[PDB]
Every structure is written in C-alpha cells, then in structure tokens.
Write a protein that binds this ligand. Structure first.
Ligand SMILES: Cc1cc(S(=O)(=O)N(CC(C)C)[C@@H](C(=O)NO)C(C)C)ccc1F
Ligand SMILES: [Zn+2]
Length: 486
C-alpha cells in the first residue's frame, strides 16, 4: 500500500525521530525552508542616494532571474556606477539556503565564494546535518521500496529545458531531443541532501521529470513529516532507464536510478577526464601528460557534462584553423591553463577565485575566460545570452584567448589584450553596435562575439561580420595570421 509503505518507513526511523533535539529539528526545517532576506531590512540599509538608483535601474539588463525579480519588488518602494552598485547589493539579497550552497559548490564548501562568517555557518549546519543522518535504510527495506523526486528540467540543463516540452502540444515530450538527453545520461551525483517522497507525488508546474529511486542498504537517511525522506549528501546514482510515460493525460520523463557509492562514479569521471586529455594532447601535439581538460563535476546531470565536452571540443576543432588552435592552446598550457567543464557555479572554480579575492568581483555565467589563469570555463546547467549552444559559447571564450595571445605577441613584456590597443578601440566605437546586442558591452566582448560569428557553421552569420563590421572583420583575420606566423 501507499500508506502501509509510509507507516513502515516511519516506524524504521521512529526512534531516530523521537531522539531529535529541538536544535536538530530546527536545522532540518531550515534545510527544507531556506531563510529569505527581508526587503524591509535591505531597503533600510540603503542610503538616500542609493534608494533612488534601484528605481531608476533597468534591472533586466545584466544577475539571475530570482535576483532581478526580488530587486523589482524593492523597486516599487547600465552606467559604471550602476553595475558596481548591483555587484555589491547582490551579496546582500541571497537567502540562507543550505542545499543551494552545497549544489553551487558541489560540496566544496570552503570555496571563498561567500563571506567567511556565513561560509562557516553553512559548514557548521552541514556538518551537524551529516551527524543527524546516521541510520541507514537497511538490508530489509532497500529493495522493497521506491522513493520519488519530481524535478524541473531546467535544473539539469536549462538549454534542453527551453525546448524539451513539445511546442506544438505541451502535454507531450519532444521525442528527438528526449533521445539525445537519454543517450548521454548514464550517471548522476547528489552533492546536496535529496528530499524524496515515499509515495509518488502528482506533478506540479514545470515538474516534467519524475525520478524513481532505489536506495542501497547502507544509504543513510532521515524521516521527514508528511511522507518524505532526507537522504545523505554525496551519493551516486546509476541511471537504469529513462522513459516517456503518461500520467493523467500528459507526458512525463520517468528516470529510474539506483544509489551507488559516489566514488564509483567519480572513478568513471576521472577515467573519462584521463581519456579526453589523451586524445587531445595527441591531436594538438602536446606532451602526453599535459593537464588541459578538467571535468569539475558534482551534480545531478553529471554524465552529460562529460559527454557534452567531447562534442564541444569537436565543433571547436571543425570550425577553427588547426594552426590557430595549436598556437593559442600551447600558449594557455604555457600558463598552466585549463578547459574547465563544470556543473558547479563559476565563482567556485579555482581558476577564477584564485585571482579574484573580492566576492563582488566574482562572476557566475555560462562561460568565462580568465587571463590570469589562461583558462576557459564553461558551465553546463545554465542558460546563455542569446546563444544557440555551448559549442558556440566555447568558441566565444576561445576568442578571448585569441585576443589574449595576439596582444602578448605584440609585447611579450607587460602583455595586454589587443582589444586594449588604440586601433581596435577606435574600431569598436565605430562598429561596436553592428553585431550582437552583447557585442556592445566592451571591446573584449565585441572581439569575442565577432570571432565567434566569423566561425559560425551558418554561412550567413560569417558574411554579416564581413559586411556590418569589415574593419573588425579584417582586424581579426590580421590577428589570426599574425598568430599563426609567430
Ligand atoms: C551559451 C554561452 C553563454 C555565455 S555567457 O555567459 O552568457 N556570456 C556571453 C556569451 C554571449 C558568450 C558571458 C561571456 O562573455 N563569457 O566570456 C557573459 C555573460 C559574461 C558563455 C558561454 C556560453 F557557451
Ligand atoms: Zn566574453
């Protein structure tokens, strides 16, 4: 029975439940219900000058959907002063969310991406919760019960989430896309505390993923009221089957998964990382043991992050001249650079935060190039600006590395980016608004966008650059030939 199964699991944890202190209970509640910031408290902290800016800021021009929405709620009550202001206010509007801190950091909670005092608070709570979850599901119950988790598609990757629901009929799933999603999804990792239902729960808004999970005998867990279980963090899941199913006259994605030791999955990730480095060290003429490609993977869409990297690098190789690729990559390797493919947020990537002490200067986005570490960083799960796919965004980031190397060759001592040279600056104030909306941001991003579009698979997109921005077009080709001939 649905009910009998519930009472049985509750009984198994009954002693554990009664044994909880009020402090333990409050901790579990805080984990389930994050402490939101009070808009009252925020606005009261702002000066008079400041208060006014928020109302005048066009907020949707940047920040994440949640943050821009919350700020709008404050509004009723970008210039260089406007970005710097938001970059600081962003630090004050974050909810205290234990599961989110664990997900964002992939469990590396010492990452200096948040205020030291709050960082330690998260750490204490996490360590105490780990201590609460000490009783395993056991050898009797584990193969007699299923546990369930409804999930938003956008949580794994917001790229597929955009068009995975059939645009024609929203009650059905896009078959082709589903087949790709299914073929690259073989294993999953939970770095935070999964909160699962004992009995399957009817889907709510944007819950088209319905996980069915079998635990292992030694999977630690704790009963939560109203028929739920909290599972220990740091577990692995093997994807046993992905199917399209029909529930109450509508289609969903069944995900069957079995809990396995996380270390077993990390083994597969490190093997894959070893493999992809072997293949590309050869193809690029690098020393066999060069560490170039990093899989920084800790979350629920783990395997696709790995598989996506292979395709991204392949597109990168198919659309950019071999000599340019070899020249620039060797330069990055000379600076111990990396191609980092990850599902944790970029402020928690060492190749960024090592060179950025100020948290308000740390950036989370779909992609980044960090000159100080000669590294390209690509975040799988998130959505890009305006961008067709991750392959193109990678080419964009590689554009930044191209900018980097070109300016270096110009002046090997006190190196700079060519987009800081007087020639491109003037080119930019002329042709800076002739390409993508994001190309307008600055010289660097304009260069990178132009570089990207000049290497698009679509013919039309590369002539556009040659058409709408011929000076930029020629300038880039000049840098390319200059680099190759170096
Ligand atoms: C799709 C995708 C999206 C981005 S992005 O984060 O939106 N982006 C701009 C983007 C047009 C290329 C970032 C960027 O410039 N990185 O260096 C900005 C937001 C700092 C990065 C990689 C990608 F593959
Ligand atoms: Zn960029």
């Amino acid at each position: 029975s649905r009910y009998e199964k519930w009472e049985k699991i509750k009984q198994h944890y009954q002693h554990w439940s009664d044994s909880l202190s009020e402090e333990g209970r409050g901790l579990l509640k805080k984990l389930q219900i994050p402490i939101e910031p009070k808009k009252d408290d925020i606005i009261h902290s702002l000066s008079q000058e400041e208060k006014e800016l928020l109302k005048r800021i066009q907020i949707d021009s940047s920040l994440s959907t949640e943050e821009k929405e919350f700020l709008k709620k404050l509004q009723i009550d970008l210039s260089e002063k406007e970005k710097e202001f938001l970059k600081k206010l962003k630090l004050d509007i974050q909810p205290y969310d234990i599961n989110q801190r664990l997900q964002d950091t992939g469990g590396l909670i010492d990452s200096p991406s948040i205020n030291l005092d709050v960082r330690k608070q998260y750490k204490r709570d996490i360590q105490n919760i780990d201590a609460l979850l000490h009783q395993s599901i056991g050898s009797t119950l584990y193969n007699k019960i299923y546990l369930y988790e409804n999930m938003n598609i956008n949580n794994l990757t917001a790229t597929l989430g955009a068009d995975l629901v059939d645009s024609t009929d929203n009650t059905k799933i896009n078959r082709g896309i589903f087949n790709e999603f299914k073929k690259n999804f073989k294993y999953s990792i939970s770095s935070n505390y999964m909160i699962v239902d004992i009995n399957e729960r009817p889907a709510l808004d944007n819950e088209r993923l319905k996980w069915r999970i079998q635990l292992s005998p030694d999977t630690r867990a704790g009963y939560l009221e109203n028929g739920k279980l909290i599972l220990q963090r740091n577990i692995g899941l093997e994807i046993k089957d992905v199917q399209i199913i029909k529930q109450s006259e509508k289609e969903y994605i069944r995900i069957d998964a079995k809990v396995v030791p996380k270390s077993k999955i990390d083994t597969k990730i490190q093997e894959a990382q070893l493999n992809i480095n072997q293949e590309w060290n050869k193809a690029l003429g690098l020393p066999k043991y060069t560490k170039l490609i990093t899989f920084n993977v800790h979350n629920r869409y783990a395997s696709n992050i790995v598989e996506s990297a292979y395709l991204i690098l392949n597109e990168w190789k198919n659309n950019i001249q071999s000599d340019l690729i070899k020249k620039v990559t060797n330069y990055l390797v000379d600076g111990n650079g990396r191609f980092v493919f990850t599902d944790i947020t970029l402020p928690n990537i060492a190749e960024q935060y090592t060179h950025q002490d100020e948290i308000y200067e740390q950036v989370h986005s779909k992609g980044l190039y960090v000159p100080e570490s000669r590294s390209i960083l690509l975040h799988g799960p998130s959505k890009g600006v305006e961008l067709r796919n991750d392959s193109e965004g990678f080419i964009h980031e590689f554009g930044h590395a191209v900018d980097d190397y070109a300016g270096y060759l110009l002046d090997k001592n006190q190196s700079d980016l060519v987009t800081n040279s007087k020639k491109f600056i003037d080119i930019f104030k002329e042709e800076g608004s002739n390409l993508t909306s994001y190309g307008r941001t600055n010289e660097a991003e304009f260069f990178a966008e132009a570089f990207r579009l000049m290497h698009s698979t679509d013919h039309a997109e590369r002539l556009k650059v040659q058409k709408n921005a011929p000076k930029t077009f020629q300038f880039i080709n000049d840098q390319i030939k200059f680099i190759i001939n170096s």
